Structures are given as structure tokens and as C-alpha cells.
């Protein structure tokens, strides 16, 4: 003798698809009111924001599911193509180039890096040409048989961005929209996926910055506890391992060459930023990391991975394998320029057991093939003055080399090169879930 | 507690206070609305192209068509108006033989909805039923 | 069926007021059971802003009219009701036909070009009568 | 007489006119060649998100009245007596001598007490109800 | 014994109004890879069987020209096929001086000059390169300058002329028009239903039948057949100015055919702007033609005779013709077969007198193909036709036509018809006669002896 | 023991902000001659429109805390771009023109201010060219090579200039701005509001009057009177930054021509893309000039400044002056006419002191510019094609703008200035009536009853 009720109300929830709507700290939007972020991002989010701890709740999560991911994805591809949409075309430029060697005071690392290359250019006025000088560094053009053309000249739609537009990270915030629920979870040492049970509910995330890199991630969050070692599938070597650490390895990278921009105009209202010429003496672009702090920091990521693999595990660490120089190498986009470091100094000691500075060098390149596509490029313009970022590395991305025998020396190199990882070892402890709150169970009482 | 507070708590104590997830589902959307116009300014922002506007748009629409989902089947079975109703449709043990006590306590509503998820669609048509035929008997007595 | 009652007398069709009544914003209940289209439908609304604009409009304006409908029922004491009688008596001026001939001899649509013109002083009667009558309860519970 | 027409007019008073208060709320103006108006810069989602804001406004105001234990009514008693706090003003000199702008200036930061305590002895009575009907 | 107003929510009550219909189709999904336009579109599934709700002792007024759908499938189209075309190959860098010469590639007299071979410095526009290439375009789509010799494209003095995608597939695979919720489509099932007036035997449908989107002029195809008679409908039968829309009640089979064994020139305009000229013709060149099977075709003119002298008295002579002058979209039959763009002469068709006093050959229509496509007779854009690899042959049925009437003065000895139309409303208007759309209106009021208790 | 009470349909409101739709009354399609405020402001207004007067309520209005202004300024900038977005780009343009004075009987007022420009044009085959010649005024053409008769178009190297779609017309039209459903405008009735104050007599409206919207600078035009009295109206009348609008009880008739009678030549410069130039002028060449008329300006300055005696002291001389320096946008009277825009130098007005003591007519001349930087953005520049035939617009001057200068020391004579330039002031006089507040329906109160 029971009756249905219905209750609504009920606190319930299922696991959804949906779409989430940024949101940044509105006190820095003056300061970067030209960021592309701050611009898109305006929405602010709540000065102090509250979140709901959910006592005796355990959720079954999957970093390696999460549809946030994947929105991210979307939503930062979508954001640099609407900041590179209204700025100039470079299609004029695509002319045979008079370059020489610049010779400059330079030092023996950089011979034949940069080349001085004068072209005609299209004025004001349609029917009038001028010569210009600009340099370029030798990954942007490609010799014809002095005359060289850019990478590509006649097979990509070169886009300059905008100068005024700042594409610096800043933290932005997801917000479930009204109807759905984001849980939080907090365990430590949570290994990416599985059972959760220390969960809270927050209607938006922690600050994330969109930060950009391929074989070690910067400006990420620190993982609570010991290093924590993720992957969809440790023991599958075709699975990217995203390592999380918890102490922040400091670096240095540096452009010492004073350039100043050159403006050109190309037509109407259409402006070519060329780099040019370098004042004071030409030295190579480099990064230094502390040497015991980084050591420690391979000790530590070693010690970890020994635990997936045996006591008795010898752990060697090698530089990149092959490929573009876009996955083969470090790169970054800090203080507007694209830099592109050598980590073979970084991923050098066979770890079997158990001041000074390593100095990576850096090559820089303007056309940027961004996303890994194909047919697309940007031209990041020149950056006035010498450049000098500070960055943590937070997270490293490796693969551990595909050894068919015993393999007991475990080789684990950088590999990586797909954002959606990079976004997703910020992006882990989230779920989007659906509120249900319509729900049926049965009581004595019937309707009277 | 909370907008899901009670989401661990048990059937029993979490029936209490359910105000808080039934007045969020709107309060949230016309929060959302508030901050979004005249707090930022920045609508040309949003403007900038037409597909974050139709999206964020299309998200709204689709809250309110959730919400009034809700609201016509609570009405469609003489709900409308209120949080907790109770019914002509008894429970059958085909679909959870469990007593009052076994459910009411030490279990909670997400387990509860895991348990009968087969039978949610046959309970909403026996609920349509009832509420047909007691319509039908009001009619009637007019 | 839906609208099956259409050619019948007003007496007879009185019995098929539920499956009519329900069917206003089926959609409410139906798009959400097509699970809102499948996800490639609502990819092509976005991609294309025109048809997404244009669906977008029809949703919201089937909504509008369901709820101005349900606010009509509210305002007159009559909400979630099918049929309920009111405190308003029947002029002379809107139709002084005997009731045999109303509820029988006369479909729907007949009945309703015949009243076409009186339609807001009905409903303007309506509210006043239920103003009149929620004043009388709270003069009564505060008695 | 006709919208807000009682705007000035004291408490007692303008309590006639809620009918029509509460019917312009949700007609609009609103209800002309479309072809220049899908224009998504301008007479496009910005319209049509003025015509989703009001809908919403008038949701969140039902569900309110829904939730609060007074559905479909447009004047309705409760069961949260009126505490001194709020005000010590006296029914004579709140429903004559002055408007209902005043008022809600007046009592404007009570709102959202007076609101929570609604919820609760709206839940109360439901709960009491299960238990009575159960019995 | 006093009567009291009732209010009733749930009245079968409409009204005819016009409103914002949403596309459906049937879910195959795999037919054509969700490429085809019309599969991206209406791509609601319409799994669940018609209602057909039938209304006894319902009679309802119906007028298929003033009907709210027509205009609205034909903005529908238009806006459809504009969204489709505009992500595609810019070609204004193909609109320079192009020099060409005849093909003389074993041409028959058919096509003697019918194809001519352009030469042109192609450049991307975006650097200082200059590449000469060749592709044979047709006489129609290419005009002389110069009044060997230089030509241009008949588009570069009107209007910038957009390559078509080739993944985009314009095939008209059938669609159904479903009304929003809070309306209903009633459709007409009257046999003979002759386009306007009362309809008695009415039923309910929340969506059409399936509709091919056909686009055609002066011969419908792949219609919906007549109920066992020729049906015969004219907003105003004896003002001649109107198109008579004809309907057959049994179908009329074309084969229609392009013999030459073409191929494509890909050449590339810029960063993935890939432009498709039309490379050299494999074998002999023949002209492209369509076969109407001649019996069937004298039965079925000989039918829509009779039905004519049912409407112009059965003692006229009634004369068919061929149509008169105009342009190239509304003087032949125009269509859109396995992706090219046929025009064909009709004169072969509607050539015959019929006086009142009471084999395996076939009609041979000459057909001529044109690559630039003004569509829907608008100015201001223009499509390029890619070239098709390989023989086309097209199957379709002739399910009606369109006929408009050159009066005989006063007296009116002799009525002369000619094939017509090109208002593309016309072709939709030949499906959507039966239906209308209409507006439910629950709410309702009414007297009766009851007292409201309080 | 009193008890709470809910009521939904409170007559109450709250200030509020959301965006309003536009409504126009009966434009049917005689006014819609493609116009940009007939064609895209579709919604009808009601043919009797409603207006509900609030006895014995009283309100705060700000008409420079009015959000309304800043929605029809944006409305207004959108229009304009979706107006001017598929119109023909004119980037051929850009080229070393060859330019000649223009002597074909022409007077000494207008020598050297029309130049005749040959220059290389593309055709609709970008392998073949075309040597055309069109007339352009001095400031729309730029001198470079000085180191003599090359000239460029003025916005060569700022912007990319568009052309204005022919059979477009932006000639103003009433504009009706109402409220969403939800919201309501309040109108302020009270004789003499200087804009600031609290306002009785007030109603309710679901629309604004007839609102023209005319783009014009240090003088409003086709504007609404006030009422018995001139009134002066300032954010803060002692900031000497900010402007002070005055309201004109009295319309002052001026009559604006361009009495030349130019014709307008069509060439292709792509594929179905037009471009078109004025060609020649039929008649003889004299200066555009609009006419005011002298004692009618006369009676309105002297109320101009008897009400302004009254903000600065009866005994204060009140001293007029022509527009500082500054770019035509700013420092003459620019407006729209016919189609073509003007550039009127006003000094001949503003140039009477007052120390409190028939049938001439105040010949302004003005110039025409075509390439026109509209809305104070360098971004882009519309390009107002030649109209056919000799334009007058005879038009009500119904405002002024002045810009009282700094006065510190020797503050006896104080000088005012026409200035402006910020075109949210040409609506600021429009709109300073009415006010948008959302409804706030529900509320709360005690009585006497109790819940069984
Ligand atoms: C990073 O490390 C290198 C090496 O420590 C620094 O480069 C110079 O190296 C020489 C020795 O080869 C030192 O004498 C110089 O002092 C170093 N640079 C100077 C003068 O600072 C480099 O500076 C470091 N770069 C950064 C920015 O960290
Ligand atoms: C989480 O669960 C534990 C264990 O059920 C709760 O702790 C006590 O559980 C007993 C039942 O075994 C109750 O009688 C007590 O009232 C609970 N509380 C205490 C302080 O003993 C705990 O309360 C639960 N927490 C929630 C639901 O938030
Ligand atoms: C417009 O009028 C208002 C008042 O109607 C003026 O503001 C008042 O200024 C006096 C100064 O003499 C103050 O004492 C009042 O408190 C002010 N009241 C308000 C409501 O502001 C305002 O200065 C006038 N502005 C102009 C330009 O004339
Ligand atoms: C516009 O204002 C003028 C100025 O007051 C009005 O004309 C008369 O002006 C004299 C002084 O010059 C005053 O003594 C009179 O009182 C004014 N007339 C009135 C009726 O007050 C003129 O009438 C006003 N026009 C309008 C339409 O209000
Ligand atoms: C980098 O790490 C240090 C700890 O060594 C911390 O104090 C600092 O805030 C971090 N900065 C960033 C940008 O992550
Ligand atoms: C990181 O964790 C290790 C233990 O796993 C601990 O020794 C270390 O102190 C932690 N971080 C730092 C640098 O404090
Ligand atoms: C990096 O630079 C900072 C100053 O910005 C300095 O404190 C730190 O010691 C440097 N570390 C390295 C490794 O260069
Ligand atoms: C770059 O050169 C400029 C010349 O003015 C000099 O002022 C500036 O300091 C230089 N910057 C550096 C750090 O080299
Ligand atoms: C790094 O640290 C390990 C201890 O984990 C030590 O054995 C090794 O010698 C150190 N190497 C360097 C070069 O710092
Ligand atoms: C229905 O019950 C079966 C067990 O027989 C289960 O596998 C399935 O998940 C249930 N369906 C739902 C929707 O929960
Ligand atoms: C709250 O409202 C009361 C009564 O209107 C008022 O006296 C008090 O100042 C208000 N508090 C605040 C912080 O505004
Ligand atoms: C239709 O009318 C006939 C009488 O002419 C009646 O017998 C039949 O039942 C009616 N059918 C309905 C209910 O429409
Ligand atoms: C093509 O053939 C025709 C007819 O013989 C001739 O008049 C024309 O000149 C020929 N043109 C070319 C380019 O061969
Ligand atoms: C169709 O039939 C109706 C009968 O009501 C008649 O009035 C109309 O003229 C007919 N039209 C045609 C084209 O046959
Ligand atoms: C008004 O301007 C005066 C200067 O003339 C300044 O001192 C005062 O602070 C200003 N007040 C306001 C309210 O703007």
C-alpha cells in the first residue's frame, strides 16, 4: 500500500553536454582592454565567488571524456580566427626578395640565421611601387633557383595580426549556464579519472590562462602532494602521459636584440610592421632553467613513473624525436613573439637510479602555422626592445618510447603537440552535469 | 546548505528545502541576464558576431523551454503550483521492492534515480492517466 | 483525434477539449522527446545564422502564446482547468439565441464569427469578476 | 485607468488596477516586412533578446509567486506574520497617505528576508499537508 | 435558468494565418553523405507516421494562389541556395579578355561552334605572376568584345560570378514542410480538386507529403500524379496573362542525355581557390539531347485537350505552339540533370492543331548546356557550373506543365496555347494547392446554466 | 497582529536599461523610397497612441544620465554601417590624379574650390583600363609631388573609402522609440524642465513622439519647440567644458542651396560594380549659401541672451564669437541636404555683444564635401555620390549649441561660442523628456488576513 509522489526540487543531476560562457576578472579590463580575451571574456565573474561542498558525495569523473575540452578547443580557435579576421592581408608581399646575409656583428651561432631582403612593395596609391628593406629570420623564407620568397607565398592565406591586439594569457573562468552544474573535484593525488570523493559544486572555474605550448606547460597550477603522473592508458606507450608537478621550475628566456618596427603602408589604411634594423649587436634567443632545481624536478617525475613500471626500473630520459619544428621543439608565445627552444638539453640523463644554469638555444619565427594547420599562417609582427619573459613550468608532456622487448629502461621524450592536452591538464578536476530536478518516489499518503 | 547541499544527504532529509534547486533554475538565468546587460556594457562585444550571440541566445531559449517542460507535465498531472503532490498511482513492487525505510533512509535521491531509471517513462504515463480520468470525473460533476 | 470534433455541434465537440487543450505547445514536450533535434541538426541552425534566427523566432513565439494563453486562464480563476463556470451573467447583446440552439445545431467556428466582436468585453468581464472575488476572500479571511 | 494609472494614487486604491498591471506585462507591443529585420547586426537577436528577457522577467515572477505557496492569484494572505522590524507603520497610515512607490522604497532592503521566510512556510505547509493527507 | 459565461480551453476553433514552417525530411542520413543541401536542411527526422486526422461534416475554404507556403518555400530555397553558394571559389580573376577559337574536335553539324576554345592570362591577383591556361567554355556563356577573336563571360558586365562547391549537392531528394506547434496544415482530399473554393472531404496533417524541389520551366518533373484526370487550374482561366497550370494524370518519360565523355581542368586560382575549366572531350562530340517517347506523348497532349475543351467550349480549335521570345530561362525547358544545367527546345512538343470534330519513334529535343547560371532571373550574382566527368543520363517524369493562352481577339475561332511559366512559384504551387496552414486558438467562451461558487 | 501579503501587479517601477525598438508611423511605402529609417524600422507604430497621465506623482529625470541617448547613438552608428556595408568599395580610386582648375565661367567666390581630375579608372576586365575625367571639390583632393598638378584623394592613405548605394536616401525620418514589453517611458510634461530636476505632471507612454533623427553640428535642425520661453539646459552650467543646449521657442526659417546644376556621369569600374562622378555643370559655377533670415535672427539671439542674463547675472556682458579652430566637422554647421553635405561657416551669426542697451537676409556661404570621415571615425569614409540638379532645403533652425570660453579674469564679458561636434547633443534635445524603468510587479505588505 504505496502511492507515487512527484518532487520538484530534487537535487539530482546527470552527465550533459552543453555550451559554457567565459568570464575574466573585470579590474584588469582597462589595463588590457586591447586583449583579445578581456574583449570576448566580458562578463564579470563574482568578486568573491562561493562554492557548495557536497558532504557524503562520491562522482565518477574522466579527463580524457570531458567535453569542456573540447569547448575550450573550439572557443580559443574560434577567438584568434575573429582577432586575425578584420586585420591586414598579406598577399602583396608574395615578390621575389633581393636578400643578403646580414653580417652584422653577429655572433657565430646566428650566421645565416637572419637575412636582409629588399622587395617592391605596393604604395598608397595604386599605381605607384616602392622598395622597401625589412629581416627576416631563415625559417620565413625559402630560396629560389639571392632571390628567395616566403614560406608560403602561393599556397597559405597569410594574415597579419593586428599589433595593437594583445594576445598575452589572462585567466578566464567557465561558467555553467543556468539549468546546469559544474563539480569540482578536489582529491588529492587524483590521477585523471575515476571515482572522486571529495566533490563541490561551483557555478564557475577556477581561473585557467589559455596559455599556449607544446613540450612543457607554463603558468599552470601546481598538483597538490607529490607529483602526479596522468594518462588515459600508462601502459598503452601511444598515449601521451601528462605529468603535473608540484613545485614551479623557474624560467628565463630572453630576445637580446633591440629592434625597432618599421611601418610601411601597403594601401589604404593598410599597414606592413617589418622588423627593422637591429640595434646593438645580434645574439642568439635562449632560455636558462636552474640546473638542481630541474635535477630534481626529473628525480621526482622519475620517482613517480617508477611506480607504474617496477622497483627495479631503469628510467632514461631522451631529446625529441623527428618532425615539424612545431612539435619537435619548445615553443612559446611570450611578450608577442613565437620562440622555438631546443629541450635536448632538458631530456639528456638515463635516471637508472638516484648556480649553474642550462642555457636551451631559441630560433624564432614570425609566419606561424598555428592549430597544426595547413594553408593558414599568421605573421606575428616585430616586438620592439629586448624581450625578457619569466615563466614556471608547471606540467611536462611525455611519451614513454614504444620498447617491444623487456624495455626495462624505461626512454620517456617529449612529445605532445595536441592543445586539446595542454588545456586539459588545467581543465581535469571539471564535469558538466544536468540538473533533473524532477523526480518520483513512493509514500503511504494518496491523493484525497 | 546549498544549491545542491542535500545532494548526499538522504531521500528523507533531503525532501527538505527544495526551494533552493526550483527557485535557482530561473534565478540563474535571469541573474546571468542581469550581469550580462548594462553591468559590463560591452554588448557590441557580444555582438561582435552573430554566433556567440545566437548561442548564448539559443541557450536561454532552451532553459525556458526545459523550465516550462517541467511545469506542463507537473500540471498535465495536477502538480501545477507545487513542490511535493501526492498522487492516485500506486507504487508497484515490480518496480522497486524496497519498503519506506529502505529508501527514505541511508540512500539518496542519485542512487534512487539510478535504481529506477527503467520506469520513469511508465510512472509519468500512469500519473497522465489518473489526472485524465480525474478530469474527466470533474467534468462529470459538473 | 486532434481536431476530430471540428465539424460536430458545440454539445458534442464539449467532449474532446482535453486532446485539443494538450496539443498547444506540443512542442514544448515533443522537440525535447526528438532530443531537440539530432546534434548535426543544431550544428547546421548555428553554422547558418539566417534559419537559426528564423527557428529561433517560431520557438519563442510558440512560447509567448502559450503563456499568454495560461496568464488569460490565470487572470480569470481558471488555471489548469478544462472547464469552469464563472461569475459573470450572459448579456442579451452577445447573443440572445435560445441555449438549444448553441450547444446544439452549431459547430465551433459558427459560434465563434458569431461572437467575434464581444470577445474582449467577455474577457474584461472575466477579470473584473475575479478581482471582485479574490477582494471578497481576503475581506472573508480577514473576517 | 488605464496602465499604471493608479501610479499616484494611495495603496487601498491602486489595489483595483492589478488586473491590468498584470496583463500588459507579457502582451508587449510587439505581435512589416520581416526581410529587413532578420538583420542580425540590428532589428535581429537584440529584439528577439528583449523578447526572451521579458519572458524570463515574467517567469521568474511566477515561479516566485508559485514557490511562495500563492499561485494564480493576484492578491493572497500568508502565514509569515509582519515583523516590526520591517516597519512600525500601522495599516491606517500605510494603506492611505501614501503610494505604493513609497512603500517599496520604504521596505526596500527587507526584500529578500521577507522572501526566504515566504519559501520556508510555503515548504512548511506542504510538508504539514503530505503529513496530514499520509494520516 | 440565467445563462453565465463558461470559458473552455481546448476549442477546436482556427484561423487561416500566415507563420514560420520548419523543414523536415525523411533520417536516411547516409544518402548523400548529409552533402546535399536539402539533407543539412530539413534534417528534423519525420520517422512517425502522417496523422491524417479526418474532419466529418467539415468544409473549408482553399486558395493555392494566395497560399503563405509557396512564398515561403520559395524564400526558403532562395536563401538556401545563396547560403550554400557563398562559402565557395571566388572567379572574378576568370573575368579578363579571352581569346578563343572554335574546337573542330570531330564535331558533328549539331554542335558545329557550339563550343568554344578560350585561352587567358590567368593571374592570382596577389603577386606579380602571369599564367596562361585554356579551358573550353560554350558558345552561351561567352560573348564577343570586339564586334583570333577576343571574348569575355557574358556575366563580367552585370555581375561577379561565384564558383559552385563540388562536395555541394543540389539533388532534390523529397522534403516535408511540418508546422510549428499551436498550428496545423489542413489538406484538401477532394478528387479533382480544381484549386480554389470549398473542399468537403478535409483532413489534419502536422506534415506534407513529400516534396521533390524540382526546378524546371515549362515542364514539371517528378510531380505528384492527378487522382484519375487531367486536372486543369487558373487563377482567372479567361484573363490569358495568367500561367494554366496543368497537372497529368499519368506520367510522360524523358531520357535525357550529354553523349560527351568530358573532363575536368583543375586549375588553382589561390590559397585553396581551386577553379575547374573544362578540359578536352574524350571522342566525338555530339550534341546533347532528350527523348520523349511519342505515343505517350500524343495520348497525354490529346488528354489535357479534351479537359481544355471542357473549359473553352468543345467546339474550339486548340492549337499548340511553340513559345514565343525571351530569354534562354523562360523560352526553353530548363533543368538541373546529375548536376549540369540543360536548356531545351520545346517547339518539338507543342507543335500540333487539334480540330474539335473529334510506333518505337521518339521526339529528339535538341538541348543546349550553359556552365554561368543566372539563377532564379535575378541580377546581381551569377553560379559556375563545375564541369562533370563522364556520359549523364537522366530518367524523369513529366508529371505536368505549365501553359499560358495567347487570346483570339473577340471572336475566338481558334485558341492558341503556349508552353510558359518561369515564376518559380508556379512549380511549387503544382504540390502545395492541396494544403493550407492555419492558426488554433484553444481559448473560448459560450453561455450555459451554472453559477461560479466562491 | 498584522500579517504579509503578496501582490503581483504592483504599479511600481525601478530605473532600468534595455534595449528599445524602433517604430515608425504609417511610412506604408510612400516615405519608404528605399530609406534607411523606413525600410529597416519596419514595426508600425499604433495609429492612436496611448498616453496615461500620473496624477500626483513626481520623478527624478537626467537627460545627461539618459541611456535612451546612447542607444539611439549606437542604433543609429549600426544603421549606418549595415546601410553602407554592401554598397560598392571605391579602392580603385586611389590613383595619381591629374588635376585642372575649373574656369568655365566661373566667379570669383568659387576659384580654386573645384578642380577637374583625369586619372586611370579599371574596367570590368582587369586586363583593360580606362582614362576618365570627374569633378572633385578642394577638400576631397590632396596636393602631393608639391616638389604641382598630381593630387590624390584625401583619404589615400587613412581609410578605405565607400561608396554611398545610389536610390538610398538618408533623409531623416520620424522615428517613434518604444518600450519592450515589461518596461514603460515616462514623460516628462513640466514646462521649463531644465533636464535635471524632479518633474510633475508626468505620464506614461508606450512610445516616444515623432524623433527625427538629423545629424548637424553647432545648430539643431527640424527639432521640437519649447514653450512660451526659451530655455537654457547644461550638465553644469559653471563647468566650462561642457555645452549648453539651447531650446529655440521660435523656429528661425533658413533656407540652404547648392545652386549649381551638376549632372552625374555612371561608369563600371568591375564586374556589375558602378561608380559615379560628376560630370559637368550646366549652368554658371556659384558657392553654396544658405539664408537666414536678419531680423528673425536678431529677435532670437536677443531671447538667447535675456535668458542667459538670468544663468550669469542681468548685468554681464554677453559677448558672441565665431567657432574656435578645428577641423569643418566642428568648427562649421554640417548637415545633411538632399543628399549632399554641407559645410556652412557661421560667423556671420555669432557675432553680436550685448551689454543690456528689414528684410536682409545673413548670406552664409558654405562648402561641399564629399569624401566624408562621419561619425569622428578615421576607419572609414563614406563617399556621398553627386545629386542631380539644383538642391534646396528649406529647414527650422529649433537649437543652438554654445560653449561658453574660460572668462576667469575680467568675468564682466563673458563669450560664448558655437561648438559641439558630439552628436549624442543632437538627441539630448529630444529625448530629455523621457526616461525607461523596468516594473517591478510584485510586492509585499501587511494586512489583517491569515492563510487557513
Ligand atoms: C643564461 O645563461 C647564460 C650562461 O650562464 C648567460 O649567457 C652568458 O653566458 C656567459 C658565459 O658563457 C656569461 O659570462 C654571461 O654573464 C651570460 N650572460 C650575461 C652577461 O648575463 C645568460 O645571460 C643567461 N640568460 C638569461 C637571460 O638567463
Ligand atoms: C555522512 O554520513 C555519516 C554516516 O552516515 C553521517 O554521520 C552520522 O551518521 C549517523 C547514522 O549512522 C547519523 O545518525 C548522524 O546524525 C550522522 N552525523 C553525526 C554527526 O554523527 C553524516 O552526518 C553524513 N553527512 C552528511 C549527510 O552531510
Ligand atoms: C536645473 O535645475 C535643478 C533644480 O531644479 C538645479 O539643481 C539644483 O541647484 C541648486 C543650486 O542653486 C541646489 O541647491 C539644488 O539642490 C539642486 N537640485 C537638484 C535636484 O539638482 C540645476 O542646477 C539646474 N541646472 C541648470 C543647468 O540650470
Ligand atoms: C516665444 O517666446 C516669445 C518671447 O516671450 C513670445 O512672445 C512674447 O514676448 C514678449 C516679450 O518679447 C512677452 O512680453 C510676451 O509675454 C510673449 N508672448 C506670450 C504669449 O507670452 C512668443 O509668444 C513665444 N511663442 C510661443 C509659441 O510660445
Ligand atoms: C611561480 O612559482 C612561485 C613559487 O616558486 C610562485 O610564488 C609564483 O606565484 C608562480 N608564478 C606564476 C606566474 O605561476
Ligand atoms: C613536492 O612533494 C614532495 C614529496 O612528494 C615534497 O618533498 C616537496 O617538498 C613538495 N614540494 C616542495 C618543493 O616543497
Ligand atoms: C630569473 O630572473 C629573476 C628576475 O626576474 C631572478 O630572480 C631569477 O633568479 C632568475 N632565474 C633564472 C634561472 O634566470
Ligand atoms: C634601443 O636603441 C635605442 C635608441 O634610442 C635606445 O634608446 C634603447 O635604449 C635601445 N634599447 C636597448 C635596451 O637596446
Ligand atoms: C640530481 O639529483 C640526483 C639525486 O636524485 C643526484 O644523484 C644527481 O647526481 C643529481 N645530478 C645533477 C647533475 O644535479
Ligand atoms: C533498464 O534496466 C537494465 C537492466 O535490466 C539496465 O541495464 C538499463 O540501464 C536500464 N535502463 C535505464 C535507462 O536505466
Ligand atoms: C534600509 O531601509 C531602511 C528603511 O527604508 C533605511 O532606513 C535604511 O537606511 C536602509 N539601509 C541601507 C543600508 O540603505
Ligand atoms: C454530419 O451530419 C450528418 C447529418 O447531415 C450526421 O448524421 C452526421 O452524424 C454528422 N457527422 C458529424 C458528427 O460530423
Ligand atoms: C568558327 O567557325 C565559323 C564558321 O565556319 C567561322 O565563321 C569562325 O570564324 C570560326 N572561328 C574560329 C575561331 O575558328
Ligand atoms: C473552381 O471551382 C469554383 C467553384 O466554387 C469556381 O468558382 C472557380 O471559378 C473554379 N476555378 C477554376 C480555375 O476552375
Ligand atoms: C560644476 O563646475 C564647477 C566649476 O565651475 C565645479 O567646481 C563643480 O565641482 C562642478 N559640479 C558638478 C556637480 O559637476
Redesign the interface.
Known sequence: ??????????????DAE??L?CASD?KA?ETKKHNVWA??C???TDPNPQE??????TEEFNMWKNNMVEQMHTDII?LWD?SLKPCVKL??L??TLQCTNVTNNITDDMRGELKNCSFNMTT?????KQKVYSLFYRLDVVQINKEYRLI??????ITQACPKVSFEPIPIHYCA???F?ILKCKDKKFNGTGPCTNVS?V?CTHGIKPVVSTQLLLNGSLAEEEVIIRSENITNNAKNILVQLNESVQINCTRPNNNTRKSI?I???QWFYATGDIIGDIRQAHCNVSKATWNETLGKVVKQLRKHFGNNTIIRFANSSGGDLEVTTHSFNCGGEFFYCNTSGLFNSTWISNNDSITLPCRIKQIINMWQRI??AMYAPPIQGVIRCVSNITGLILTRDGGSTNSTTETFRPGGGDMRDNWRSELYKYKVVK?????????????? | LGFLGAAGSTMGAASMTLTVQARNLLSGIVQQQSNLLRAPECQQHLLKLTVWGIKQLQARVLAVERYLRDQQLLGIWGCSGKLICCTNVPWNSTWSNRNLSEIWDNMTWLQWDKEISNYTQIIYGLLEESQNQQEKNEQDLL
Not at chain 1, 500500500?1 to 546527470?14: F, Q, R
Open positions: 500500500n504505496l502511492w507515487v509522489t512527484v518532487y520538484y526540487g530534487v537535487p539530482v543531476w546527470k552543453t555550451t560562457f573585470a579590463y574583449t570576448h566580458c562578463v564579470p557548495i561542498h557536497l558532504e557524503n558525495v574560434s575573429q598577399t602583396p608574395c615578390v598608397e596609391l595604386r599605381d605607384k608560403n607565398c602561393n599556397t597559405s592565406a549556464p543556468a539549468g552544474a559544486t557555478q603602408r594601401g589604404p589604411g594553408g593558414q540538473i533533473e530536478p524532477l523526480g518520483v518516489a513512493p509514500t503511504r499518503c494518496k491523493r484525497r
